[PDB]
């Protein structure tokens, strides 16, 4: 009923804000994480619609809130415009990136209480919420979004920070790479609007090959893998091996000049930083989450690559539900609506006494 018994859940993405009501199966609002201010304020879709008279900024970079004034504008927009709520009437769960600095989570806490007067709030790690969305408290999550990719091992509900891996290769970088390789094929994409066209191409037509070399050979042997795509002006372009070369970058970051191992190897590295006693549990519970895990074929590719890295007899399971583009939000919706979670919120009374640093003893 969206009343005082209902918590709010806001997932603060580098690319998209997902927001809604705890207990709902899907976010009520999904909008671009941008703020527009006069050239020479508006948020989200309205900011984009008025782009001709505004200059636009992303307040969240690689999963970390970096522009606080613009973030307050995003949160105000989220509550008042998108959800149509009074934040003083609802416990509010915010998400944070893995390894979010102490000062950052303190500031999130401060703003919720001092600006928005929430009665209660909590900050949860995005990857932990994705695990919870699958009904698990132990496993290793690969969360790949628009701005950052993380491998997060979690045992009994606790992320294990020493074993967390961060890779600053995610969806936006994949779009940029697709622009580059389409350009190679003859089709020029370079501007901000063109980057949005290519993001759409990526989401609609890209996929992950099970065997990259074999797929390259298939693409060379006939036009069977080619797809046509119509641009806004009516021009129709062809996409071929670019369909799978783009997300291949996740497995081979050298495609964009990065020295990092690919996401299968970072998954392995993260597991190996954890005690051997929980190893079987991690391998048997590999959860994929985030928009950049939506590529057809990626779960099968990860199953194959993890199998190649793991001991021969290890039981491997890749969990990648159809709803995984929103599983951070969905996990937050589940958690914030559990009766046994209600004792876990930081209350406004607790905040009044302890200040922002209370977040470190309440939220982990």
């Amino acid at each position: 009923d969206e009343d005082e018994t209902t918590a709010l859940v806001c997932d603060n993405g580098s690319g998209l804000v997902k927001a809604g009501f705890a207990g709902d199966d899907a976010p009520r609002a999904v909008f671009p994480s941008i703020v527009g201010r006069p050239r020479h304020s508006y948020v989200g879709d309205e900011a984009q619609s008025k782009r001709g008279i505004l200059t636009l900024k992303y307040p969240i970079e690689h999963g970390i809130i970096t522009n606080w004034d613009d973030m307050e504008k995003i949160w105000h927009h989220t509550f008042y415009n998108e959800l149509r709520v009074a934040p003083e009437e609802h416990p509010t769960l915010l998400t944070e990136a893995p390894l979010n600095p102490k000062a950052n989570r303190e500031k999130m806490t401060q703003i919720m209480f001092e600006t928005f007067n929430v009665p209660a709030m909590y900050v949860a790690i995005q990857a932990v919420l994705s695990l919870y969305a699958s009904g698990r408290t132990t496993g290793i999550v690969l969360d790949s979004g628009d701005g950052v990719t993380h491998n997060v091992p979690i045992y009994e509900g606790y992320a294990l920070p020493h074993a967390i891996m961060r890779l600053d290769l995610a969806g936006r970088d994949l779009t940029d790479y697709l622009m580059k390789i389409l350009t190679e094929r003859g089709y020029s994409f370079v501007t901000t609007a063109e980057r949005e066209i290519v993001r759409d191409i990526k989401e609609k037509l890209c996929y992950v090959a099970l065997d990259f070399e074999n797929e390259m050979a298939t693409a060379a042997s006939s036009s069977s893998l080619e797809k046509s795509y119509e641009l806004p002006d009516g021009q129709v372009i062809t996409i071929g091996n670019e369909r799978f070369r783009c997300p291949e970058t996740l497995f081979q970051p050298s495609f964009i000049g990065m020295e990092s191992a690919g996401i299968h190897e970072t998954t392995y590295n993260s597991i190996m930083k954890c005690d051997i006693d929980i190893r079987k549990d991690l391998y048997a519970n590999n959860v994929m989450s985030g928009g950049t895990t939506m590529y057809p074929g990626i779960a099968d590719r990860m199953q194959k690559e993890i199998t190649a890295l793991a001991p021969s007899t290890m039981k491997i399971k890749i969990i990648a539900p159809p709803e995984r583009k929103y599983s951070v939000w969905i996990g937050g919706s589940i958690l914030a609506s559990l009766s046994t979670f209600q004792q876990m919120w930081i209350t406004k009374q607790e905040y009044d006494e302890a200040g922002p640093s209370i977040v470190h003893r309440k939220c982990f």
Binding site: D25, G135, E156, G157, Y158, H162, D275, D277, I334, L335
Partner: peptide, 30 residues
Amino acid sequence: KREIKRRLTRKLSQRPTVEELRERKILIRF
């Protein structure tokens, strides 16, 4: 659709302490 909530509730209620996880070298602060 709500089996997940039952499962999570039970698992969270049965979790070991942070102290136990540190003693088992699962959580490693330093």
